Design a protein around this ligand. Structure first.
Ligand SMILES: *Cc1c(COP(=O)(O)O)cnc(C)c1O
Ligand SMILES: *Cc1c(COP(=O)(O)O)cnc(C)c1O
Ligand SMILES: O=C(O)CCCC(=O)O
Lengths: 438, 438
């Protein structure tokens, strides 16, 4: 038996079974809220349905004619089932008038804490705000230094900059796009207070070694897990874990929201206080901290969150199926040394699907795929943090050289992958990818 | 001929006309979105309805016996008609998948811009965020001093403190609870860069004099108008006007939102950039400012705002009626010398109703209305900015004494006032207040 908890490791186990590679594995599903859709869709009397065809039942394969591919059409991220359920919960929340704090905010924090196996959760107004509050709660002061990679979304460095701290950029691992633990200790000075690893594209960093370093220098760890919800054993070594529930993440609400996650009650208390004006917990208009933000989640978005999180494990399952299909159908382009593919691992939730186009062919392939084959691809993110055309960069990061980050930035390309894409759509992408690499 | 544009002055004129003070005045209504409910309820064929009974048609007065009064029951602040329209609009927005930016954000900014007669509006994720971003856009750096009053909600000073600037408190005048223009000049230094007047409780500060002072020293003015939507001529003299649409304000959404309002195109662009990660507008992932926040309004809350703002002018008219009835019915306590009441003025939108309990009986009155008469009263706000139990206040605001502010703080008490309260409920408050002073 394996008991599907809704995390990446179990989903990868379930996928190989749904394709039949299992050894008569008894699967059962935990009835937690992130499994709600999966349990309705694939299970029947707490056992896998006998009659599951992935292509027909899960992806609705019907040989539809495809003429163009967009990378992330927003209208396909939400399903009619989601919408009907959201309307239902809004009709319950709206009459209450509780539109700031509320019971749905607290229910979502309980759900997230259970899902992540962490004691304390502060649901926030965005992942960016969660990070800012979290930096403040560990005691970050203006001029303090925060070690971080240079290839994240701008929010990561912005949270550090917004409170007057100093990003110190460290090179990545070319094997995982994650910050390299072997280069972290070199960057530690008297001014560093925090290491800020990013679980980029849905894959986790090598957190075990970072913790060992963090303990020797007595540094805090705040993990940017804004793209990594559902990854197994997420946050085992972190002081604080940051989540984002923006509508584009593996799990989103209908608007902006995020969360702070921790087992450390002292940090949890300060985060709750900083996220709401410095007021003592649930003592509005009475400050104990010097200041704070207006950064807790909306009760209404928490209620939408509790409806949409029902689809999380199922949508992550569709994501891992799509990623494996890309890997298996592009392998010969890798054997020809034209591209490098990601490897299937049990922690990746496949928020984004990166490949590397080597021999300097990335720009030609991206541009031809769009201009010739009507296929959008994207580069997350087009500019590295030490390379923005800002006054901050020109004064502080001109001499920054991040060898692996910069090299892989010239090769990276992200392929369309979202849980409601058709297999005919992925076929379109796959054939363009193959045709342009003849 | 009086043209009702949905603002303060005309509402006071209309109220005088709707009562026995009419002067055969002809009223017309402008079909703007904030007038929607007003026009539907009080007008017919584009003329004022003939036999409007304020108590019976607007408040449904039936002498229902009341046993208890809550200060601000959140369930009573939103109507079923609003809920219906919200459900209706969300069935249209939700299928678009457009949950961050979107067309409703843009429409709400046009609507607010028209209503305030200002060229540029950036809809934000909160009033607090709007204030922080505006301060950034005028160039506030760490160390710049911001002249404020000390009697505002924490957010006003928190926005200054959050970006490293230093608030410079200035006393109020005893007449309006607003910053005393007489004392602005006293506090101006080489380091002052902005004056931050607060239109507290819905009453406008004497802005014409503040503009005079600010121009002598070439200072920007940022108006915290988070309590004052609908006040006539709002922002005539300020560089930027901060609005809040939090759900307990005269107009609110069903979550957090705000707006930045300006005629200055250069500030609006910077506000737009600081509002979304420092990115150039419509060119994401390419930064032009050093950093930014994630603080634009959610498209979903903008759709909601466009539904709820239909009630604003009508809900402000119920507020003024309530205010006047408290005034006329409590003056027996004013003539006695036990209390002091606000004066009806054309600019007050009556977000809160303040009175002053004289000669040190405020605490006993407040506590006996609750234990003896089950009447909730509240103090907005319980702690002054310079007296909080924070490390800031003792290290910073220890020699700081603000005479009229602190003395008024011992007298102040707010009476329940919200546009859906019953007159039976207000009469219950009035009998408790007279009884407790017999
Ligand atoms: C999206 C994202 C963020 C910010 O999350 P928001 O909820 O949009 O503010 C931070 N870090 C990473 C890696 C992200 O992908
Ligand atoms: C409510 C309020 C704020 C903050 O507004 P939010 O939208 O809640 O962030 C700021 N100033 C005053 C005077 C307020 O009443
Ligand atoms: O912060 C809040 O939720 C309340 C502010 C608005 C008000 O009640 O005056």
């Amino acid at each position: 038996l394996t008991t599907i908890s809704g995390h990446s490791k179990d989903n990868l186990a379930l996928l190989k079974c749904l394709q039949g590679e299992t050894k008569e594995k008894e699967f059962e599903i935990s009835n937690v809220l992130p499994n709600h859709k999966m349990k309705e869709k694939l299970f029947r009397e707490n056992k896998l349905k006998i009659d599951i065809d992935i292509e027909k039942d899960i992806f609705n394969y019907s040989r539809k004619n495809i003429q163009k591919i967009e990378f992330m059409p927003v209208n396909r991220l939400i399903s009619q089932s989601e919408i009907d359920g959201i309307i239902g919960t809004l009709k319950e929340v709206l009459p209450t008038g509780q539109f700031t704090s509320g019971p749905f905010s607290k229910k979502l924090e309980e759900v997230i804490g259970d899902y992540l196996n962490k004691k304390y959760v502060i649901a926030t107004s965005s992942g960016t705000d969660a990070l800012m509050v979290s930096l403040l709660s560990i005691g970050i002061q203006p001029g303090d230094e925060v070690i971080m990679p240079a290839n994240s979304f701008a929010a990561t460095e912005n949270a550090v900059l917004a409170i007057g701290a100093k990003p110190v950029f460290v090179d990545i691992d070319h094997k995982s796009y994650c910050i390299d633990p072997l280069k972290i200790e070199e960057a530690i000075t008297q001014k560093t207070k925090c290491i800020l690893p990013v679980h980029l594209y849905g894959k986790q960093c090598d957190m075990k070694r970072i913790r060992e370093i963090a303990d020797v220098y007595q540094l805090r760890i705040i993990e940017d897990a804004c793209q990594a919800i559902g990854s197994s054993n997420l946050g085992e070594y972190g002081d604080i874990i940051i989540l984002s529930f923006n509508p584009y993440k593996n799990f989103g609400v209908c608007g902006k929201a995020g969360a702070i996650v921790t087992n450390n009650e002292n940090l949890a208390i300060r985060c709750n206080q900083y996220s709401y004006h410095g007021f003592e917990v649930d003592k509005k208009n009475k400050k104990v901290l010097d200041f704070g933000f207006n950064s807790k989640i909306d009760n209404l978005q928490a209620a939408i969150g509790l409806e949409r999180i029902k689809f999380l494990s199922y949508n992550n399952l569709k994501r891992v199926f799509l990623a494996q299909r890309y890997i298996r159908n592009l392998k010969e382009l890798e054997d020809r040394e034209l591209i490098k593919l990601p490897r299937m691992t049990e922690d990746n939730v496949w928020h984004l699907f990166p490949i590397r186009i080597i021999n300097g062919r990335r720009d030609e392939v991206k541009n031809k795929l769009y201009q010739l084959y009507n296929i959008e691809t994207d580069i997350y993110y087009p500019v590295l943090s030490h390379k923005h055309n800002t006054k901050l960069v020109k004064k502080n990061y001109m001499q920054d050289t991040l060898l692996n980050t910069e090299q892989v930035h010239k090769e990276i390309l992200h392929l369309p992958l979202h849980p409601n894409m058709l297999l005919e759509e992925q076929n379109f992408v796959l054939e363009g990818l193959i045709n342009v690499n003849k």
